[PDB]
Write a protein that binds this DNA or RNA. Structure first.
Ligand SMILES: [Mg+2]
Ligand SMILES: [Mg+2]
Ligand SMILES: [Mg+2]
Ligand SMILES: [Mg+2]
Ligand SMILES: [Mg+2]
Ligand SMILES: [Mg+2]
Ligand SMILES: [Mg+2]
Ligand SMILES: [Mg+2]
Ligand SMILES: [Mg+2]
Ligand SMILES: [Mg+2]
Ligand SMILES: [Mg+2]
Ligand SMILES: [Mg+2]
Ligand SMILES: [Mg+2]
Ligand SMILES: [Mg+2]
Ligand SMILES: [Mg+2]
Ligand SMILES: [Mg+2]
Ligand SMILES: [Mg+2]
Ligand SMILES: [Mg+2]
Ligand SMILES: [Mg+2]
Ligand SMILES: [Mg+2]
Ligand SMILES: [Mg+2]
Ligand SMILES: [Mg+2]
Ligand SMILES: [Mg+2]
Ligand SMILES: [Mg+2]
Ligand SMILES: [Mg+2]
Ligand SMILES: [Mg+2]
Ligand SMILES: [Mg+2]
Ligand SMILES: [Mg+2]
Ligand SMILES: [Mg+2]
Ligand SMILES: [Mg+2]
Ligand SMILES: [Mg+2]
Ligand SMILES: [Mg+2]
Ligand SMILES: [Mg+2]
Ligand SMILES: [Mg+2]
Ligand SMILES: [Mg+2]
Ligand SMILES: [Mg+2]
Ligand SMILES: [Mg+2]
Ligand SMILES: [Mg+2]
Ligand SMILES: [Mg+2]
Ligand SMILES: [Mg+2]
Ligand SMILES: [Mg+2]
Ligand SMILES: [Mg+2]
Ligand SMILES: [Mg+2]
Ligand SMILES: [Mg+2]
Ligand SMILES: [Mg+2]
Ligand SMILES: [Mg+2]
Ligand SMILES: [Mg+2]
Ligand SMILES: [Mg+2]
Ligand SMILES: [Mg+2]
Ligand SMILES: [Mg+2]
Ligand SMILES: [Mg+2]
Ligand SMILES: [Mg+2]
Ligand SMILES: [Mg+2]
Ligand SMILES: [Mg+2]
Ligand SMILES: [Mg+2]
Ligand SMILES: [Mg+2]
Ligand SMILES: [Mg+2]
Ligand SMILES: [Mg+2]
Ligand SMILES: [Mg+2]
Ligand SMILES: [Mg+2]
Ligand SMILES: [Mg+2]
Ligand SMILES: [Mg+2]
Ligand SMILES: [Mg+2]
Ligand SMILES: [Mg+2]
Ligand SMILES: [Mg+2]
Ligand SMILES: [Mg+2]
Ligand SMILES: [Mg+2]
Ligand SMILES: [Mg+2]
Ligand SMILES: [Mg+2]
Ligand SMILES: [Mg+2]
Ligand SMILES: [Mg+2]
Ligand SMILES: [Mg+2]
Ligand SMILES: [Mg+2]
Ligand SMILES: [Mg+2]
Ligand SMILES: [Mg+2]
Ligand SMILES: [Mg+2]
Ligand SMILES: [Mg+2]
Ligand SMILES: [Mg+2]
Ligand SMILES: [Mg+2]
Ligand SMILES: [Mg+2]
Ligand SMILES: [Mg+2]
Ligand SMILES: [Mg+2]
Ligand SMILES: [Mg+2]
Ligand SMILES: [Mg+2]
Ligand SMILES: [Mg+2]
Ligand SMILES: [Mg+2]
Ligand SMILES: [Mg+2]
Ligand SMILES: [Mg+2]
Ligand SMILES: [Mg+2]
Ligand SMILES: [Mg+2]
Ligand SMILES: [Mg+2]
Ligand SMILES: [Mg+2]
Ligand SMILES: [Mg+2]
Ligand SMILES: [Mg+2]
Ligand SMILES: [Mg+2]
Ligand SMILES: [Mg+2]
Ligand SMILES: [Mg+2]
Ligand SMILES: [Mg+2]
Ligand SMILES: [Mg+2]
Ligand SMILES: [Mg+2]
Ligand SMILES: [Mg+2]
Ligand SMILES: [Mg+2]
Ligand SMILES: [Mg+2]
Ligand SMILES: [Mg+2]
Ligand SMILES: [Mg+2]
Ligand SMILES: [Mg+2]
Ligand SMILES: [Mg+2]
Ligand SMILES: [Mg+2]
Ligand SMILES: [Mg+2]
Ligand SMILES: [Mg+2]
Ligand SMILES: [Mg+2]
Ligand SMILES: [Mg+2]
Ligand SMILES: [Mg+2]
Ligand SMILES: [Mg+2]
Ligand SMILES: [Mg+2]
Ligand SMILES: [Mg+2]
Ligand SMILES: [Mg+2]
Ligand SMILES: [Mg+2]
Ligand SMILES: [Mg+2]
Ligand SMILES: [Mg+2]
Ligand SMILES: [Mg+2]
Ligand SMILES: [Mg+2]
Ligand SMILES: [Mg+2]
Ligand SMILES: [Mg+2]
Ligand SMILES: [Mg+2]
Ligand SMILES: [Mg+2]
Ligand SMILES: [Mg+2]
Ligand SMILES: [Mg+2]
Ligand SMILES: [Mg+2]
Ligand SMILES: [Mg+2]
Ligand SMILES: [Mg+2]
Ligand SMILES: [Mg+2]
Lengths: 131, 386, 52
RNA sequence: AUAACUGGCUUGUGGCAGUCAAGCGUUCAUAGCGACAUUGCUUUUUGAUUCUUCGAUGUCGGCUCUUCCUAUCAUACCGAAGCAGAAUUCGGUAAGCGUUGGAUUGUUCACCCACUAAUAGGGAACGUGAGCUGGGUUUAGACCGUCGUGAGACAGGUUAGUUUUACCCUACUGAUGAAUGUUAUCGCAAUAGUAAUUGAACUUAGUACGAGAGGAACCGUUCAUUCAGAUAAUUGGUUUUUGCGGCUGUCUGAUCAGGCAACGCCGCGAAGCUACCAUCUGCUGGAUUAUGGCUGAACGCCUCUAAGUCAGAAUCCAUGCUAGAACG
RNA sequence: UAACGAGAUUCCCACUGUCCCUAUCUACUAUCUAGCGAAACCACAGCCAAGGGAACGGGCUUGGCAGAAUCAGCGGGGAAAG
RNA sequence: GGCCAUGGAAGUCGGAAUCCGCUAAGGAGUGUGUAACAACUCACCGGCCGAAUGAACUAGCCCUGAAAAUGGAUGGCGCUCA
RNA sequence: AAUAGGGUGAAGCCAGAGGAAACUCUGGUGGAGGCUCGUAGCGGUUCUGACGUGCAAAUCGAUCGUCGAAUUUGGGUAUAGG
């Protein structure tokens, strides 16, 4: 439910980001990006605010070995906003969600990109500092 | 057998051949279609690419997440001193296309435009247009006869105008002379306007208004001979490929036993003639204005020029045009600004632009000041100031 | 629009110029150019950088 | 005079499509199917043959790149339904435009995970090795199993095993250029090429439709995918600016200032170049196809058609864009 | 079966331009010049489409067409050379 | 409002029957239209007009059936009471 | 005749401690080995790198195996085509 401008992609397929919610997962391994078209040899890649299909590589045993949606909330690759500002975070992080974008955890550790919070009201509710 | 996977083609077949332009001055291939009901007005202007800058502007785009919010945008400065009208050409509709009937010139031509017709001006007797200038002898009935012929037979009237390149910081002394089509009014009206404008200056503010959408005709940056990888954006071959990797591996099937015209090959890149459309005019500045870079919110008395001047151009001391985004060409290139060939009613075309602030920090480095006063206020007194 | 100030050197940041770094603790850092940003990522002391 | 690639004839076999219509389809042959039969098409299967090549056409697959076909997976416009909506199925014009990222496998093939509008099928010497690679196959070394008294064999498994030459001609991509009195400027435009593509969100609207469950579309608005052409504001990348600073060893008696370390090393580093790692830009008219119509005979009625005619597709031709005929 | 192995194989951490997806820089070439100066190969030669033909033509037939002399690259063809 | 099934179906849902009487005229029903009737329309008969008309079949040319990969071949141009 | 510089630390030996004894433990010393890292040397794994009408009818570059012995090597000498 939103139309965010294009951002510099930070997380190609195979990237492992931090898991920033209290769901019990610590890793999020990107295996696909929602909305990725066709281009030979080109890897699908996600920016902050993108829905991702992921597995939990490190965390509680009941979270491991499954494909589940997740949303990237911060990225360390700098990207330009329409106000001319180049910004980046210290790390790449995401949170586990539904296909509808509803969190499976209940809290978020760290800041959240305004692009991500503007696009997912669920993540905005559970988010603290929003940049 | 077919390709294993279906990928799109590399490059566009509508910009072939990728050869050098025949001239460095970009030529207007097509002018706006003539409407008699409009007033008589020019359709083009000649300028020089000075450099790029940055502005801040409040966006008026309902439904956007940046609506009524500041956006930071790249802009291009085109140095456009007024052009001088020196001639007029008539075109006739024929079953073989437009054909030039007659060219009528002004009595006096400036030295910068008379240098256009010479390769070695310093070694010449400078005899160009002297007998033609004599054609104006005490009655100028030859000129009036040719002008009457144009009024009687011409269907397309174009003026001949040249830039005043001596007012720019360029060391080139040759002016750039071009045909600019006259639109509006009858053929007689166009001819009267052209004759009455002989040896007169025409400013940009008489051709382009602010917030207008215009097209840019220019010759792009030359890069010389280039391989397929960068000329055509082809995939690099693996690192361990014998005899090199910046190639196209297969340049054709066995049959046709020839190389096809559609296969990417190494060759000359850049220096192409391009027509780029829908560039919005953010500002038509005046050289006499002491607040070129000032806005209604930034009242700093400030010219459009950055600190230390435009890199490899100099200062813009003339009227100028501030365009949104990027235009083809390099610095000092002659650029042709043409009016749009259609009517655009999109929100992007009809938005009224009001600028907040224009960046004038140095482009020669990580400039951090907008003004020498701001600099000396930040740093204070230095040793060289005593 | 607002003029920003370098976190490492106090240099004036104008719209667009420089990068903006959000640390893990959500503290916002502003760098007017790559030069001051690179020194900060080396954990230098701006109090001991002679031109800040 | 003769077998192993490609090519040629054939097309049993493989693949695809018809005709009649016994049946299926709650009724109802033909919305969608369709037996017993029967007529065909194709050369991406495999056979059959041995015409070309044995004084040699480099034999698998993948990577790269261009193009073509349509028996159309998606996208445009439509007709049909056992089409209320949504979805879906059948069909017409259609190849303009797209048709993916990975695990295993040398694989072609296959099979899974996942995105996607879709992950259609094929040809061009089973396209493509003086383009690559060399994992497979298919020399010689070696191991195993079975066979053989044995030397050895295996169309069985395994491991290691040199991938040569373009400066010629043509063709492509670009670049000059004699002569059509000389030289210079501004132009015209024959011909050739051509470019855009698809998705999402808001509104329409919880509306039409529907008992409900569910649930559209046109105008409009903001964004996004793939592609194309530029550009260097900004940010990032790059450093022989060996520009400034720092560091080690050694050499110049020390200092200052320097040499060398097969650019000695490190931090920053403008300019230039450059990145969906950055920004900008990608037009509007006509004629048509399928189709639905108007008037209207043939055939006193009827009929989109026979004469005539209207609207109308991602189609075509223009506008626009690129080159400018070096004998326009 | 400890130890050993430039032996064959699978996975993990670190590292990574192998890749997404490419970009930039240096020296030596290539390039141009003075001097010097070979070789492979060679029936004649050298633009295409279709036809037929020893069933894949540069030449034949029918068409498209066709304007001197040339330079750097390139790897489709000469069923190129060896 | 023929019947039975069927709430009912009265011609028009599925079954039956496949009738009779009058009728120059009428299916115990063609369809619309109905929950069924009503209602309208067709088979059906007539009133009007001024000579053709209906069905099945045969074979000439033409069209459909008729989909492949470089652009391309009644030899080419072109040809339509040829 | 030839073989940098390091690592490891075998027997034997010295001192101390525990135990009734048989013995054990600790700290040194010592400097063994077809041991090990690694030059010269000897060899030749991989890039299937360069070159591939070469500098060269086997080389060049990096990388690599081993490097105190079944080591490397000069000269003399012996063995001669089934
Ligand atoms: Mg691939
Ligand atoms: Mg292929
Ligand atoms: Mg024109
Ligand atoms: Mg004349
Ligand atoms: Mg004349
Ligand atoms: Mg250059
Ligand atoms: Mg240059
Ligand atoms: Mg390059
Ligand atoms: Mg190789
Ligand atoms: Mg070479
Ligand atoms: Mg700059
Ligand atoms: Mg930088
Ligand atoms: Mg072959
Ligand atoms: Mg063939
Ligand atoms: Mg068959
Ligand atoms: Mg056949
Ligand atoms: Mg068959
Ligand atoms: Mg059949
Ligand atoms: Mg049928
Ligand atoms: Mg076959
Ligand atoms: Mg097949
Ligand atoms: Mg034979
Ligand atoms: Mg054969
Ligand atoms: Mg042979
Ligand atoms: Mg051979
Ligand atoms: Mg050969
Ligand atoms: Mg031969
Ligand atoms: Mg062969
Ligand atoms: Mg060959
Ligand atoms: Mg592969
Ligand atoms: Mg079709
Ligand atoms: Mg269809
Ligand atoms: Mg039905
Ligand atoms: Mg196509
Ligand atoms: Mg076609
Ligand atoms: Mg189009
Ligand atoms: Mg995809
Ligand atoms: Mg796939
Ligand atoms: Mg793969
Ligand atoms: Mg793999
Ligand atoms: Mg794979
Ligand atoms: Mg594999
Ligand atoms: Mg498939
Ligand atoms: Mg075949
Ligand atoms: Mg092959
Ligand atoms: Mg080869
Ligand atoms: Mg191959
Ligand atoms: Mg080849
Ligand atoms: Mg092998
Ligand atoms: Mg091979
Ligand atoms: Mg062998
Ligand atoms: Mg046997
Ligand atoms: Mg036995
Ligand atoms: Mg045996
Ligand atoms: Mg045998
Ligand atoms: Mg074997
Ligand atoms: Mg093998
Ligand atoms: Mg070559
Ligand atoms: Mg070569
Ligand atoms: Mg040669
Ligand atoms: Mg030759
Ligand atoms: Mg040519
Ligand atoms: Mg050429
Ligand atoms: Mg050319
Ligand atoms: Mg569009
Ligand atoms: Mg709703
Ligand atoms: Mg609802
Ligand atoms: Mg409802
Ligand atoms: Mg309703
Ligand atoms: Mg309702
Ligand atoms: Mg219902
Ligand atoms: Mg609901
Ligand atoms: Mg719509
Ligand atoms: Mg580009
Ligand atoms: Mg340096
Ligand atoms: Mg240091
Ligand atoms: Mg020192
Ligand atoms: Mg020295
Ligand atoms: Mg030095
Ligand atoms: Mg030395
Ligand atoms: Mg740096
Ligand atoms: Mg820079
Ligand atoms: Mg420079
Ligand atoms: Mg692009
Ligand atoms: Mg756009
Ligand atoms: Mg255009
Ligand atoms: Mg129309
Ligand atoms: Mg019609
Ligand atoms: Mg008609
Ligand atoms: Mg021209
Ligand atoms: Mg010409
Ligand atoms: Mg002539
Ligand atoms: Mg002539
Ligand atoms: Mg190994
Ligand atoms: Mg191993
Ligand atoms: Mg094994
Ligand atoms: Mg050469
Ligand atoms: Mg020379
Ligand atoms: Mg010779
Ligand atoms: Mg053919
Ligand atoms: Mg023919
Ligand atoms: Mg043939
Ligand atoms: Mg033939
Ligand atoms: Mg053939
Ligand atoms: Mg031919
Ligand atoms: Mg031949
Ligand atoms: Mg001929
Ligand atoms: Mg020639
Ligand atoms: Mg060749
Ligand atoms: Mg040859
Ligand atoms: Mg046919
Ligand atoms: Mg054809
Ligand atoms: Mg014909
Ligand atoms: Mg025929
Ligand atoms: Mg004939
Ligand atoms: Mg004791
Ligand atoms: Mg002790
Ligand atoms: Mg020792
Ligand atoms: Mg050591
Ligand atoms: Mg030896
Ligand atoms: Mg070697
Ligand atoms: Mg090699
Ligand atoms: Mg070579
Ligand atoms: Mg050799
Ligand atoms: Mg070593
Ligand atoms: Mg070594
Ligand atoms: Mg050894
Ligand atoms: Mg060793
Ligand atoms: Mg013998
Ligand atoms: Mg003998
Ligand atoms: Mg003998
Ligand atoms: Mg014998």
């Amino acid at each position: 439910s939103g139309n965010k401008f294009r951002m510099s992609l930070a997380l190609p397929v195979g990237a492992v980001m931090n898991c920033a919610d209290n769901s019990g997962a610590r890793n999020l391994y990107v295996l696909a990006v929602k909305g990725t078209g066709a281009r030979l040899n080109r890897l699908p890649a996600a920016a902050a605010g993108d829905m991702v299909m992921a597995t939990v590589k490190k965390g509680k045993p009941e979270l491991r070995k499954k494909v589940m949606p997740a949303i990237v909330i911060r990225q360390s690759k700098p990207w330009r906003r329409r106000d001319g500002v180049y910004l980046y975070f210290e790390d790449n992080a995401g949170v586990i969600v539904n296909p509808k974008g509803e969190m499976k955890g209940s809290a978020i550790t760290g800041p959240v990109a305004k692009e991500c919070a503007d696009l997912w009201p669920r993540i905005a509710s559970n988010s603290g500092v929003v940049v | 057998s077919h390709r294993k996977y279906e990928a799109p083609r590399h490059g566009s077949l509508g910009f072939l051949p990728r050869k050098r332009a025949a001239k460095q001055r970009g030529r207007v291939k097509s002018f706006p279609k003539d409407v008699k009901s409009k007033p008589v007005a020019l359709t083009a202007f000649l300028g020089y690419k000075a450099g790029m800058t940055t502005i801040v502007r409040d966006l008026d785009r309902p439904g956007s997440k940046m609506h009524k919010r500041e956006v930071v945008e790249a802009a291009t400065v085109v140095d456009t001193p007024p052009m001088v009208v020196v001639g007029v050409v008539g075109y006739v509709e024929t079953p073989r296309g437009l054909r030039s009937l007659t060219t009528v010139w002004a009595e006096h031509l400036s030295e910068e435009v008379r240098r256009r017709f010479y390769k070695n001006w310093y070694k010449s007797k400078k005899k160009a247009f002297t007998k033609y200038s004599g054609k104006y002898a005490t009655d100028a009935k030859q000129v009036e006869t040719e002008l009457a012929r144009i009024k009687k037979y011409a269907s397309v009237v174009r003026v001949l105008a040249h830039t005043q390149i001596k007012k720019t910081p360029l060391s080139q002394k040759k002016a750039h002379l071009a045909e600019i089509q006259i639109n509006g009014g009858s053929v007689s009206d166009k001819v009267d306007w052209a004759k009455e404008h002989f040896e007169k200056e025409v400013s940009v503010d008489s051709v382009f208004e602010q917030d207008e959408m215009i097209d840019v005709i220019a010759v792009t940056k030359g890069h010389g001979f280039e391989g397929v990888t960068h000329r055509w954006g082809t995939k690099k071959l693996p690192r361990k490929t014998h005899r090199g990797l910046r190639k196209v591996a297969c340049i054709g099937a066995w049959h046709p036993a020839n190389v096809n015209w559609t296969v990417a090959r190494a060759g000359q890149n850049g220096y192409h003639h391009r027509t780029s459309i829908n560039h919005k005019v953010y500002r038509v500045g005046k050289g006499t204005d002491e607040a070129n870079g000032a806005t209604e919110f930034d009242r700093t008395k400030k010219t459009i020029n950055p600190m230390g001047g435009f890199v490899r151009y100099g200062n813009v001391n003339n009227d100028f045009v501030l365009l949104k985004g990027s235009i083809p060409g390099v610095k000092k290139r002659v650029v042709t600004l043409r009016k749009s060939l259609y009517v655009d009613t999109s929100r992007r075309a009809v938005e009224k632009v009001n600028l907040k602030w224009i960046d004038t920090a140095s482009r020669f480095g990580k400039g951090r000041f907008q003004t020498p006063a701001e600099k000396h206020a930040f740093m204070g007194t230095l040793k060289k100031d005593l | 629009m607002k003029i920003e100030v370098d976190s490492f050197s106090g240099s004036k940041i104008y719209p667009g110029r420089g990068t903006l770094f959000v640390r893990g603790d959500s503290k916002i850092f502003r760098f007017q150019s790559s030069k001051s940003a690179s020194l900060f990522q080396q954990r230098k002391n701006p109090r001991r950088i002679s031109w800040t």
